[PDB]
Amino acid sequence: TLPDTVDWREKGCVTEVKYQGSCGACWAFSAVGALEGQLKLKTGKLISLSAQNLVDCSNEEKYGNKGCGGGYMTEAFQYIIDNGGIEADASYPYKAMDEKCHYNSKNRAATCSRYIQLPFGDEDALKEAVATKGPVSVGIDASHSSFFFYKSGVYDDPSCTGNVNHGVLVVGYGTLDGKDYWLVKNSWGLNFGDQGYIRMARNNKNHCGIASYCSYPEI
Ligand SMILES: *C(=N)C1(NC(=O)[C@@H]2C[C@@H](S(=O)(=O)c3ccc(O[C@@H](C)C(F)(F)F)cc3Cl)CN2C(=O)C2(C(F)(F)F)CC2)CC1
Numbered sequence: 001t002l003p004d005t006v007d008w009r010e011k012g013c014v015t016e017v018k019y020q021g022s023c024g025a026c027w028a029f030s031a032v033g034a035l036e037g038q039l040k041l042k043t044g045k046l047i048s049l050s051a052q053n054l055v056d057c058s059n060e061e062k063y064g065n066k067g068c069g070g071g072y073m074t075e076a077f078q079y080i081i082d083n084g085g086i087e088a089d090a091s092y093p094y095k096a097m098d099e100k101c102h103y104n105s106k107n108r109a110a111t112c113s114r115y116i117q118l119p120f121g122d123e124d125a126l127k128e129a130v131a132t133k134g135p136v137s138v139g140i141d142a143s144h145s146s147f148f149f150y151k152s153g154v155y156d157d158p159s160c161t162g163n164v165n166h167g168v169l170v171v172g173y174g175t176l177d178g179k180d181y182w183l184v185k186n187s188w189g190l191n192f193g194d195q196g197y198i199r200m201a202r203n204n205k206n207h208c209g210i211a212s213y214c215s216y217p218e219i
Pocket residue numbers: 020023024025026027064065066069070071072073138139140164165166167213
C-alpha cells in the first residue's frame with residue numbers, strides 16, 4: 001500500500017522555484033530537480049544543480065537537446081551519466097541563454113549512474129515512483145492560459161491533450177476536496193501558481209499527458 005498523500009518539500013528534498021525566463025530550459029530545470037531530490041536523499045545535502053550546464057553541454061546530435069530551443073529530461077540524465085557529473089548552480093549559474101560549455105569536473109556537485117523510464121500513460125506507476133523513489137521528471141501540455149492563470153484548487157481543463165510541450169517536476173500527490181491531484185513544481189518563477197506550484201488532475205485519463213514521458217535518475 002502507498003500513502004494517500006506525498007509532498008517531498010516536507011522532507012527537504014526540493015530546492016527553491018526557478019524562473020527560466022526567455023530560454024526554453026524547462027527540460028533542464030525538471031531534470032536537475034529530480035537529481036536534486038536524489039542527491040538530498042543519498043547525501044543529506046540539498047543543492048540547486050546547474051540547469052545551465054545542461055543547456056550549454058548537451059546541445060549536440062548524440063542527445064538531440066537544443067539548449068534554449070528545448071530538450072528532453074531523459075537525454076539530460078544521459079549527458080550527466082556520460083559526462084561523469086554536473087556542477088552546482090552556484091559555480092555554473094543560469095544565464096537564460098545558449099553559451100559554450102564550461103563544465104569543470106573540479107566543481108562536480110552530483111553524478112548519475114542510470115535513469116528509469118516509467119510506462120507511458122501509467123498513473124499508478126507514477127504514483128508508486130513518486131511515493132517510493134522521489135520527485136519525478138515529466139512532460140505536460142502547458143499550452144493553455146488556464147494553466148498559466150492557476151492559483152488554487154486542482155487544474156482540470158477539458159481542452160488539455162496529451163500533446164506535451166513543457167518539462168516539469170512532480171514532487172507529490174494527494175486529494176483536495178474530493179479531487180485527486182499531482183503536485184507539480186514549475187520553473188516559471190515564484191509568482192506563477194501557488195508559490196511556483198500547481199496541483200494538476202490525477203486519475204483523469206492521463207490528463208495533459210502528465211504520465212506520458214516520466215523519468216527519474218539514480219545517483
Ligand atoms: C520548455 N521550456 C519547452 N519544452 C520542452 O523543451 C519540451 C519538453 C519535452 S516534452 O515535451 O515533454 C516531450 C515531447 C516528446 C517526447 O517524445 C519522446 C518519445 C522523444 F521524442 F523524446 F523520443 C518526449 C518529451 Cl519528454 C520535449 N520538449 C520540446 O519542446 C521538444 C524538443 F525541443 F525537445 F525537441 C519536443 C519538441 C518549451 C521548450
